[PDB]
């Protein structure tokens, strides 16, 4: 039992049955809201300091 | 080209919804940035609140060291100066 | 039939709900007191003329049939706004406004008694009277005086009784207050501090 | 296992959901009940109950299968509740002495002169001032009873539960004699019938009407005295500005110079000081202040009595206490530094 | 007098003295002066209402009180 | 044996057990039990756990099916109990004397000494300070002093952010005020610290009901629970802001909050220790003088000292130089301080 980790609970007698390795918050909706890949340095030109 | 270490969540998009609505202590983002310790956070009354929880973490209480939190705006910087 | 229909009312307490609207494509939309909607194309044990949209009705938990009309539509605050005590005030208390007593009675009391006094002549009755002056000159005296002295159901109304923080229409307390008063008080309505809302 | 065996016999015995009564029908029991949250209901009784005591504003036992009425009980019961400085602000305890003291003592001033007993006072004034002092200073002389009610305690999400506490209070005040229930924050309790066809904040409203009913009219006060604390007589009720209810309206803002010397005596004797010092100079130094602020002055002279090892507080400890609190603590620490006057 | 109908009123009361020396009163203030005659008559514990207590109500704490006689001399 | 009767009590317990709030003791061991939704049969109690541990209206362990009272409750833990209850005395009593040195004594003899030695009040009849506000320019040391008294503690220290109490559910804020002061009560004489409550005044939020009448109720519960009744005794509470204007004066009034402590920006005598100790762990060409940096900037924070004293090492170590020339302090202080209002636009001051 890890504190504040989530589990797989049966609906049978609410038998505490399995434990689910998970992340909790909207992590998917905005956790990975990056701009992934793009390009290289060549199209910058001037703000080099 | 840092291969893991830049997760631009862009931090201001639905600003009255991505910030505080559902993510009160927006630290859900900070749990992202810790549990994806190669990351870089970017952003563009709630803003004052979440500002203060930024300052609750990033004032010397920090796991993967600095991440890289960045905000950008323009033309006058008269956001709340705390 | 009616043994099992008494049984349907008897099954559980037969969940009093709300009618949302009524169509005639005879047909009615139920909102439960669980705030759940159930259309029926068949009403059942009442008539559509007997009901109207916006009513507390008894509905079966199982068949979802409109079973009975509740005799509990009592309307909070209004039915409490009806002054049932009727304190006494004879016209001996009104000193100095006796001409206003006379034009008051000719304006108001006689349309309650004799419209034949108006419509054998054949024009109209009067429509609304404004009382004003300094606020110690006495505006309650016509309310309690016409309450006790003129034998009709005295209804009162105040100014800030039309302002609730929660909004959405000004047509429920007003329209069910006068539509309330169309039957059990259709002669006397006292609006007070109308200048508090007449802005 | 002190009683485990009978518990295995109580398992065939389980009945009676909570089920607060709404109202009744006519000629018949035919009662009407909401449970808590689900719905509203036109119920019938199990036959082995008393059909008399299923009256409205009550919760009965109610079956799960048939929802039939089992026995009720009143919900809220037994656990509810847990002055030498009589004389602060001066003329306040004289009017309080009139309106409180004279019906408790003499129906000779009232009936022989032909009036009603004045039964309530609308107290109005800034906080931190002594509404607590005056109202609890009444409790020296009734007998020894005082009940203290904040109005904001009644902010609940259950219909008429504040009004149910009006029932509880007006059925505890009549049990004991010469009792004192205190009212406070009476703006959230309501005097003005705010209402528009939407139906929101109305437990305030129906609780306020129950307050009208059980307060004055419908079995008059007697040996129960209740004052109302406010900053404003504005948002009040003309049904409670009905002048047989609350007609005195005792006023108080500040002590003059010498009430402050009296509070200097109060918070002076209550701590370790030196009895060779004066206080009229300090009452000159206090133009506008509360006695709580006077206590802050006395504790601040206590702080200088901590810094130096002092238990007999000199005049100068109070001098630096006032020059602290009123001058070096007004905004920053510099209201003066210009002569121009002297 | 309507306010002093049910109250015990001594016959040493001239209502025209009272309401004549009133200036600019509404019946809110007729009632205020009459009930304040009940209360000022109620202070010392008189057996009935007294005309002095009516006259005291006539000047219920000088309306707005104050009374600084600075500059008026 | 006791394992058998204990297993019998365990078999009185039906494995799906619920958690529900009492309303009132019905004295004859059958009770009536609210859930969160309140379906309240005339249930009984498992008569081996003590019924007389609990006041009426306290949560218990119940059943789903018969709803019978099974056991005793333990606590209430939220995401805040982890944060309110500070686990360790974290760090940093002080890394550098010479920060303030003025209100250090004031927080010491005002907070620490009445707490640590509460015997002086016997000698004098003084009440302890209950509420002290620590406020001023941002990043002065106030949060750092909270971590100072957190480390240099003697009590169960409590760390609260003022914006933790903001929810969309009704009553949830005041509920966490009740759990909050329950935490503040039941450990020992604890040091509660609450920060950034100047951001609770002109503030409206997303996860929220009607704004002006939500946090008025929660802050109202703070006004009632904080310094109303429930006998303070020895419960230290320290709050902190940066501004003052949104403060409702109903808590600012005495009784509730006693001391209001400002913070200035430091003078040059205290600057030298912060400049020096921020440079105490770096290789530096000591021929340069810090006194230009100590004199020049008039309204620095310590983060300006920190930022310059790191930035000059960014300029020397920018070119792999272990020691720092004075011109790297020039580019350092000109890199940290920006928009120096001296001339250009108006510069009327010349
Ligand atoms: N006129 C006064 N005479 C004596 N002591 C006073 C006076 N005014 C204030 N005090 C002191 O200041 C304190 C003010 O707190 P108190 O107990 O009256 O609660 P309170 O806030 O004044 O009540 P309220 O705010 O509902 O008027 C008193 O307890 C007393 O120590
Ligand atoms: N020895 C010192 N002397 C004077 N000032 C110091 C010293 N050490 C640090 N400081 C200042 O005190 C502050 C300590 O951190 P602080 O908690 O004030 O930052 P913060 O979290 O931004 O504060 P706030 O949130 O209240 O603005 C630093 O910003 C620094 O400028």
UniProtKB/Swiss-Prot annotation, chain C:
ATP binds at residues 133-140. Coiled coil: none annotated. It comes from the Eukaryota. It is found in: Cytoplasm; Nucleus. Sumoylated by UBE2I in response to MEKK1-mediated stimuli. Belongs to the AAA ATPase family. Component of the 26S proteasome, a multiprotein complex involved in the ATP-dependent degradation of ubiquitinated proteins. This complex plays a key role in the maintenance of protein homeostasis by removing misfolded or damaged proteins, which could impair cellular functions, and by removing proteins whose functions are no longer required. Therefore, the proteasome participates in numerous cellular processes, including cell cycle progression, apoptosis, or DNA damage repair. It is linked to Deafness, cataract, impaired intellectual development, and polyneuropathy: An autosomal recessive disease characterized by early onset of deafness, cataract, severe developmental delay, and severely impaired intellectual development. Patients later develop polyneuropathy of the lower extremities, associated with depigmentation of the hair in that area. Component of the 19S proteasome regulatory particle complex. The 26S proteasome consists of a 20S core particle (CP) and two 19S regulatory subunits (RP). The regulatory particle is made of a lid composed of 9 subunits, a base containing 6 ATPases including PSMC3 and few additional components. Interacts with PAAF1. This is 26S proteasome regulatory subunit 6A. It comes from Homo sapiens (Human). The gene is PSMC3. The chain holds residues 75 to 293 of 439 of the full protein.
From Swiss-Prot, chain D:
Monoubiquitinated by RNF181. One of its GO terms (cellular component) is cytosol. GO terms for biological process: osteoblast differentiation; positive regulation of proteasomal protein catabolic process; proteasome-mediated ubiquitin-dependent protein catabolic process; ubiquitin-dependent protein catabolic process. This is 26S proteasome regulatory subunit 7. It comes from the Eukaryota. The gene is PSMC2. Induction: Expression is not cell cycle-dependent and occurs throughout the cell cycle. Its main location: cytoplasm. It comes from Homo sapiens (Human). The modification N6-acetyllysine is found at residues 36, 331. The lineage of its organism: Eukaryota, Metazoa, Chordata, Craniata, Vertebrata.
Curated annotation (Swiss-Prot), chain F:
One of its GO terms (cellular component) is cytosol. The keyword Lipoprotein applies. One of its GO terms (molecular function) is ATP binding. It is a lipid-anchor. Transmembrane segments: none annotated. Residues 1-13 have a biased composition (Basic and acidic residues). The modification N6-acetyllysine is found at residue 168. It is found in: Cytoplasm; Nucleus; Membrane. GO terms for biological process: proteasome-mediated ubiquitin-dependent protein catabolic process. Belongs to the AAA ATPase family. This is 26S proteasome regulatory subunit 4. The lineage of its organism: Eukaryota, Metazoa, Chordata, Craniata, Vertebrata. The chain holds residues 91 to 440 of 440 of the full protein.
